[PDB]
Amino acid sequence: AFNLVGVGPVSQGMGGIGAAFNIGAQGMMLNPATLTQMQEGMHLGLGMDIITAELEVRNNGPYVAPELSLVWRGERYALGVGAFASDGVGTLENYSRLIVLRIPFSAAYQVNEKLSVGASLDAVWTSVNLGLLLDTTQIGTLVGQGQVSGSLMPALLSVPELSAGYLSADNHRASGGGVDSWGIGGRLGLTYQLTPKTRVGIVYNFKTHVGDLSGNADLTAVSAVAGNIPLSGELKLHNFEMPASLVAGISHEFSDQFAVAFDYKRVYWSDVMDDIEVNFKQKATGDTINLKLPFNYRDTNVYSLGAQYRYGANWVFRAGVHYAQLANPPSTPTTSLSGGFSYAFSPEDVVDFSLAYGFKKEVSHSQIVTSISYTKSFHHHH
């Protein structure tokens, strides 16, 4: 949903690991089986991700993604709920901002001293702001390929000197602009302590069925002669299905003071079919314009490697490497380096902090994700 630099400052500080490593309450969103690693009691977590991006040769500004968690740990069970947000933008510009708020309902169980199982069911709210410029040639290539339809086509081609159509659907540029939808996702994982120092973990993340995103949009016809004629109406996006993913990984704790974790993850873009329809209906007339953009993606592999050193009773230090690349059934991979630390102000109060620098690819893409969280733990153990 994000970009697996991980979930929370402990995972992100270690390059994205978490299939077998106790990343805290964020395990709800990675491998919920790891929640059995948390101490008994009640855990409240507050944090956010602060993403600033830069692109050499679309807002760079600080994106803020908050995370809330409540986890109960007693005996063999863990129960959790939270709210995990992601924010970011892709690319009269062509752009898409995607907001995903995932609200897990999570549980985990120690089957025995070696085997832990866990699952989450997400309620998922997806929101997209977008702008899409289509010139006269592109409309043509797409009208002859049977990809544009709707009674708005002939009236638009008859705009004098028509140069481009602009689909705008943005909360920030017009009130109620954008589209949104509630949906459902989830994950099912386990951990296995096969060796006293080596734990292995596996989690399958389900395909998120987001369902039809609806809302408001403007379609502006651009003409040097006739001005920019905006038409207002309803917009519907059709077939989204965030892809399933499989994460397998291992944690090795040479001592309580020093651990290393490594994870491998396959994201299954190829099994998301592509019927991605875009329909706009003009609110005065009921005249519509229909549009397909079936864009296929290939599977992605991600490798995550990090380490953690407990220094004294209050300080923990982390570092990690992250490598994402298209999959085996020619592309530049994305690499990221990370570091982080934790401070415990008390047995009940811990601050975690994370910094990750990523790079992709004539295009250069630089991205810094700052991650900070606070956990307040009230213990119980009877």
Author numbering: 3 to 59, 75 to 108, 127 to 364, 373 to 404, 419 to 439
From the paper:
Thus far, only the FadL OM channel family has been shown to mediate transport of hydrophobics. PpF1 has three FadL orthologs, of which TodX (Pput_2883) and CymD (Pput_2901) are located in the adjacent tod and cym/cmt operons respectively. In the presence of TodX/CymD, robust growth is observed, providing the first direct evidence for MAH transport by FadL-type channels.
To enable similar experiments on CymD, we first determined its crystal structure. Despite considerable efforts, we could only obtain one crystal form that diffracted to sufficient resolution for structure determination. The CymD structure is very similar to that of TodX but lacks density for ~30% of the protein due to mobility of several extracellular loops within the crystal. Importantly however, the visible parts of the structure show that the S2 bulge and the S3 kink are present and in the same location as in TodX. The lateral openings (delineated by the green surface) are similar in size in the wild-type structures of TodX and CymD and differ only slightly from EcFadL, in that the latter does not have a bulge in S2 like TodX and CymD, but a more pronounced kink in S3. Compared to PpF1-3-cymD, PpF1-3-todX grows slightly slower on toluene and clearly does not grow on p-cymene. This suggests that even closely related MAH channels have different specificities, with CymD being able to transport more bulky substrates, such as p-cymene. Interestingly, the equivalent sphincter residues in CymD are Ala3, Val106 and Ile373, suggesting that the passage from the P-pocket to the lateral opening is narrower in TodX compared to CymD. Due to the difficulties in crystallising wild-type CymD and its similarity to TodX, no attempts were made to crystallise CymD lateral opening mutants.
